[PDB]
Design a protein around this ligand. Structure first.
Ligand code: NA
Length: 528
């Protein structure tokens, strides 16, 4: 009995076919890059103050003091959710009494905005926050729509695998890419907040589905070695490239409708790949469609320029290939033994905390001091070296110390943020970027570490559980940034403390480097 990897070895690990599949599937991830974190610009909050109509007979003296003041960063700014009672202000404004002299501004009555907000346009022209006034009493609705986006991402992860197994990798890939672009485009015509949130949920469901489908297809077509490079550096780097390109558009386009129009344009180009990406021959063989798999294999061989007589490719054996034993599906197997139970709980906590930190640090860029566009670009740029370093470390160093050090650096750098004085405010940004670098590195390494820790019989189930925990952590991430209203540094304190605790936790996991991967739970390494 041969194996698929052994029968198709005559194609070679690298060449025009593998090069084209690799770069066409990796480039298909660029739309996933700027779509996920577009909330940084679509749902931004400009400066605002209580509106006052023009019908009030207020002189220039009162027109400068219609809103109470508050201190912020030492300086004073207008109150964002209160205004002096317009009836009372006008009552003696008409009579000629002057502000601050006759009537004490510290004793006047206050009321919430009855006529709306102003939403200064220094940086943004319009956002969904300005569109539907998601401020003050309704400010909690801004992080809710982001959480619902990640909820949709969560739900899409469950059904995408089953759907692609039932209907094929390419079909689901392109269908979900089409639905993601169609629903993202329809948001331009949103009529109310509810329609926008529902469409955002479906957008996230398609974004995850067309990411998982492309990942599976790429990992199934490519060879034994190029598979790991594609899985770890290809898609991640192209996602980072998309994330880096996201702020370049937002710099020129500052209207959420036009920004959505621009960000959805590249997704249309990805439809041109239908004639250049083949179906996974392994899946077709598993379906019994050996003729199509043979056709695709012969086309690939012709593309690579390898002469393929019967003595080097016999399609009869293609119908009688070996098949690996099914992995267990009962989730109880992960919790019926002490060691695997402890490992699973530690992996869940690790993945959830890393995801929470990674997304909280990415969503908090608009609040840092400096240019929001440059800060977003820097946040995206540091991911590339993080991925390269993660790959090199996994290639040459033990995972336990590598991840422990990465998490320690990331968590510790965030705690020092409160100590930076305003004279060197820019030192805060570099600390945040270093923390993002460390968190990205740890997030990249944790996948390979967890995949190595679990045995073959429950590897897929354990990785899936850890991924679901990571999705939950991502869902929770936007609410950590929301705490910035109640305290400027609380989100960083929380994320740093959790990252440090996770770093200490990593030192208790067993070390898989240099040890053969186990096949059964009894061969699983024992926790410290
Ligand atoms: Na994609």
């Amino acid at each position: 009995m041969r194996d698929y990897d052994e029968v198709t070895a005559f194609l070679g690990e690298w060449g025009p076919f593998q090069r084209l599949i690799f770069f066409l599937l990796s480039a298909s991830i660029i739309p996933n890059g700027f779509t996920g974190l577009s909330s940084v610009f679509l749902i931004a909050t400009p400066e605002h103050r209580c509106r006052v109509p023009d019908a009030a007979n207020l002189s220039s003296a009162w027109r400068n003091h219609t809103v109470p003041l508050r201190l912020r960063d030492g300086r004073e700014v207008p109150h964002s959710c209160r205004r002096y009672r317009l009836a009372t202000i006008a009552n003696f404004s008409a009579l000629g009494l002057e502000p601050g002299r006759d009537v004490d501004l510290g004793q006047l009555e206050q009321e919430s905005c009855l006529d709306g907000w102003e939403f200064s346009q220094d940086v943004y022209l319009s956002t969904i926050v300005t569109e539907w006034n998601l401020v003050c009493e309704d400010d909690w609705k801004a992080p809710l729509t982001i959480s619902l986006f990640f909820v949709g991402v969560l739900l899409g992860s469950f059904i995408s695998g089953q759907l692609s197994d039932r209907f094929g990798r390419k079909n689901v890939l392109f269908v979900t890419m089409g639905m993601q672009t169609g629903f993202s485009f329809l948001q331009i015509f949103s009529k109310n907040f509810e329609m926008f949130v529902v469409l955002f949920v479906l957008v996230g469901m398609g974004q995850i589905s067309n990411y998982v489908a492309a990942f599976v297809l790429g990992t199934e077509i490519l060879g034994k070695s190029v598979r790991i490079i594609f899985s770890t550096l290809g898609v991640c780097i192209f996602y980072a490239f998309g994330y880096m390109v996201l702020p370049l558009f937002a710099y020129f386009i500052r209207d959420w409708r036009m920004l959505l129009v621009a960000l959805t344009m590249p997704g249309v180009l990805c439809v041109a790949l239908w004639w250049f990406i083949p179906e996974s021959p392994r899946w077709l063989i598993s379906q019994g469609r050996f003729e199509e798999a043979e056709v695709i294999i012969r086309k690939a061989a012709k593309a690579n320029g390898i002469v393929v007589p019967s003595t080097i490719f016999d399609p009869s054996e293609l119908q009688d290939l070996s098949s690996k034993k099914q992995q267990s599906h009962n989730i109880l197997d992960l919790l019926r033994t002490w060691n695997i139970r402890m490992v699973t709980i530690m992996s869940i906590m690790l993945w959830m905390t890393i995801s929470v930190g990674y997304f909280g640090l990415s969503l908090d860029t608009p609040n840092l001091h400096g240019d929001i566009f440059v800060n977003c670009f820097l946040s995206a740029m540091v991911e590339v070296p993080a991925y390269v370093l993660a790959w090199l470390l996994l290639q040459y160093l033990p995972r336990r110390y590598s991840m422990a050090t990465a998490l320690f650096l990331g968590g510790s750098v965030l705690l020092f943020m409160q100590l930076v004085p305003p004279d060197l405010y820019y030192l805060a940004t570099v600390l945040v970027m270093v923390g993002k670098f460390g968190v990205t590195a740890a997030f990249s390494m944790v996948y390979v570490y967890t995949a190595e820790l679990y045995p073959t019989v429950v590897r897929n189930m354990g990785v899936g559980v850890s991924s679901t925990a990571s999705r939950l952590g991502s869902i929770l991430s936007p609410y950590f940034v929301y705490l910035g209203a109640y305290d400027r540094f609380l989100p960083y304190i929380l994320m740093g403390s959790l990252t440090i605790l996770t770093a200490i936790l990593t030192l208790f996991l067993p070390e898989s480097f240099g040890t053969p991967l186990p096949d059964t739970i009894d061969q699983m390494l024992r926790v410290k």
